[PDB]
């Protein structure tokens, strides 16, 4: 009767830690740690759902506040766990250290906190229906879903720790080797190099240096906005037929529209705009002809693909945004990206840079030329690994990290460093 | 319970599932409709709509309503054909399915048309669904946000029926008076909290003071005025005025999304439309002009339930309320409507329905769609909530076959009457 009607019996919230490369960016550089929150949604029939989400100190604080007060509801009453999210949060607003996925607000902290839920009630709707998240979507559109190698300049290992596999990477040679290693292995067709880490004329000769050594990939820059507006046009222009697009150049809706009527390529963001207040904006100003959609920030998959329609509508089109993140991240993202027509240009994904670290079990991730295929499981098609999870977890207990600070440990070496904002 | 069918052994958990269409039948059907006076005519004595059932393989069924117009039926008997085979999952590869079998390529925009015969089936699947689940439709949607969604009283200028045969139940309503004692009737039957009127028929100095007579029968609710584009930009902004404080919301007043852009800028009340934008390609348009305050969705153009639904977010997004647009219609959509409405936050005013015009004509099955205080109750049963009750579709289908009527024509059966007369558009 009552406990037969695929209500939350209860949630499951687990903080994780795992190792990060010391990846450098606009503002600073990775910690050795990498914080994650686990979800794991149960009904009282005992079919549970996982989802995953950010793992900073003020968010976990929230998704644990969040999490006790679902015992009861529906897992298919979406709209009602919005509701009750939103009434958690309250006047509370989340803001990050980095600023790399922009400025926070009431609606943005919302999303945040709803979309580990929304992922993990989906995986449970997938469950009960013995069909993918996928088709809960309207089905797949593609049958895999290509990622693009994420290049980054790094160390060559942190502080008193070992030195990763992977080697430094400061010139156009070492992002050049960094990514025979990554296609190597993955077989990614397409290339995103991060920037702001050194001088703009520095990272255009390494992305010229990677057109030689791949001709036919597509090439995306990242900034993360260190760059002024004349720079950008500079850079811009310079590039030209080289890049497919220059995302996040410079500061802010206007200075990202004066630069994207002077270059000849696209722009695209995941920082200007990062929530449904910003869309009138853009599409007033185009500051954009790509999104990077996230659905860790707008909210889940369901939302995510409403959102990607509106782009549609306007004539914006979409790729999909990455943090570091494990397999469950990379399900809901591979699903979403699946079954969704106007998601087109290869997805980020920060998965090499992780080397192998993961929560869920072995077997339904993989990487086929560059592409990950639809899981074959009813839901997410993911398990979670329980002995890896009390590992991570037990990390996490350990690290001495609460909160994502890249600005914070570049600064202990440079104490005049600050976030690069158009800087260069 | 699934008793060992379908799952892993021993337990109630399903494995990877495939459900494919088997069949689909489509049935176009005929039922009573009194003489409803709008800008375009007279509404003539049969309505007509086509009845979809899609049947899976496993012989889950699912219902859907459309159009009954002869071309779109056409249309919808084309695809219903091409469609075996494919999942009911599958709603993208449905869509584009659809799409190649009437000449479209959403890869001219012919999406108008895909949209509108997309969305029966799209319907019947979701309601297929939504029994694989034991779900009702709006749990697919997101969760029911009300128990009930609220329906206007639609109240319309008529005759007391059609030329040379028995006047209907309602009686005549030329005039103010006719006007208030329709509402009467229609709000003591079915209780509606909320009343439209379809104007466009008589001078607006004429509707205006029907709307009046309302608001002083009715003090409490909410009035919608609809001319259908009868007016002038000018006699829009000059009745829209003069009814500071008593409408709602003003529909459809003038023409186009100029002329409804410019009525908007000086009216004291929002706009609404269900005429100028009515498929995506017109919201960039709509949120650079601003002809309107209140978008009326309808499913049975905007592409069926899922699509609807996206729409609504970007009103929301770009401070458009909403509300629903409907037709002459039958149970089936009316069910849907209800689901959709129930689910969507952003569907915040009473929808529309011309329920009370059947007069009790209905294909389902009775006892699942009532009206309680002006509201219906989200239906229980997994799926839409309703049943085909078949000895009636065969009655209706009899009806169809049977009658004069193929295509809809207001103007053409007003003029059968009077030759002089032409559908009002930007004419008061």
């Known amino acids: 009767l009552y406990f037969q009607s695929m209500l939350i019996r209860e949630v499951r919230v687990t903080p994780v830690a795992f190792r990060d490369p010391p990846l450098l960016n606009a503002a600073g550089v990775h910690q050795p740690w990498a914080l994650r929150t686990i979800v794991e949604v149960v009904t009282d029939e005992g079919i549970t759902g996982l989802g995953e989400t950010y793992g900073d100190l003020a968010h976990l604080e929230q998704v644990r506040a969040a999490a006790a007060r679902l015992p009861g509801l529906d897992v298919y009453a979406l709209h009602r766990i919005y509701r009750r999210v939103a009434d958690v949060v309250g006047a509370n607003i989340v803001t990050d250290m980095h600023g790399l996925t922009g400025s926070s607000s009431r609606v943005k902290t919302v999303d945040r906190v709803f979309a580990a839920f929304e992922v993990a009630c989906l995986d449970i709707q997938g469950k009960a229906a013995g069909r993918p998240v996928a088709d809960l979507l309207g089905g797949k559109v593609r049958d895999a879903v290509p990622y693009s190698a994420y290049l980054f300049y790094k160390w060559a290992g942190h502080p008193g720790k070992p030195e990763d596999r992977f080697g430094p990477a400061l010139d156009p040679d070492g992002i050049v080797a960094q990514a025979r290693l990554l296609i190597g292995e993955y077989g990614f067709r397409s290339i995103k190099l991060k920037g702001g880490v050194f001088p703009p004329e520095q990272e255009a000769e390494a992305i010229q240096a990677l057109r030689d050594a791949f001709p036919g990939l597509p ?206």
């Open 219 to 424: 090439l995306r820059l990242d900034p993360n906005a260190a760059w002024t507006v004349e720079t950008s046009i500079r850079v811009g222009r310079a590039l030209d037929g080289v890049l497919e697009y220059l995302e996040d150049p410079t500061p802010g809706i206007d200075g990202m529209a004066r630069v994207a009527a002077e270059v000849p390529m696209p722009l695209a963001t995941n920082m200007c705009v990062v929530t449904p207040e910003h869309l009138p904006a853009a599409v007033e100003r185009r500051p954009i002809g790509v999104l990077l959609i996230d659905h860790h920030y707008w909210g889940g998959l369901v939302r995510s693909a409403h959102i990607a329609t509106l782009c549609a509508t306007f004539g914006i089109e979409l790729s999909m945004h990455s943090n570091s993140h494990l397999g469950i991240s990379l399900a809901a993202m591979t699903h979403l990206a699946a079954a969704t027509p106007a998601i087109t240009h290869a997805c980020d994904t920060h998965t090499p840079w992780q080397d192998g670290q993961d929560v869920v079990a072995p077997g339904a991730l993989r990487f086929v030329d560059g592409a990950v295929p639809v899981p074959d499981g009813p839901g997410l098609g993911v398990e979670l690994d329980r002995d890896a999870l009390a590992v991570m977890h037990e990390q996490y207990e350990r690290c001495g990290i609460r909160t994502r600070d890249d600005e914070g440990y570049m600064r202990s070496f440079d104490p005049s460093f600050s976030t690069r904002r158009g800087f260069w």
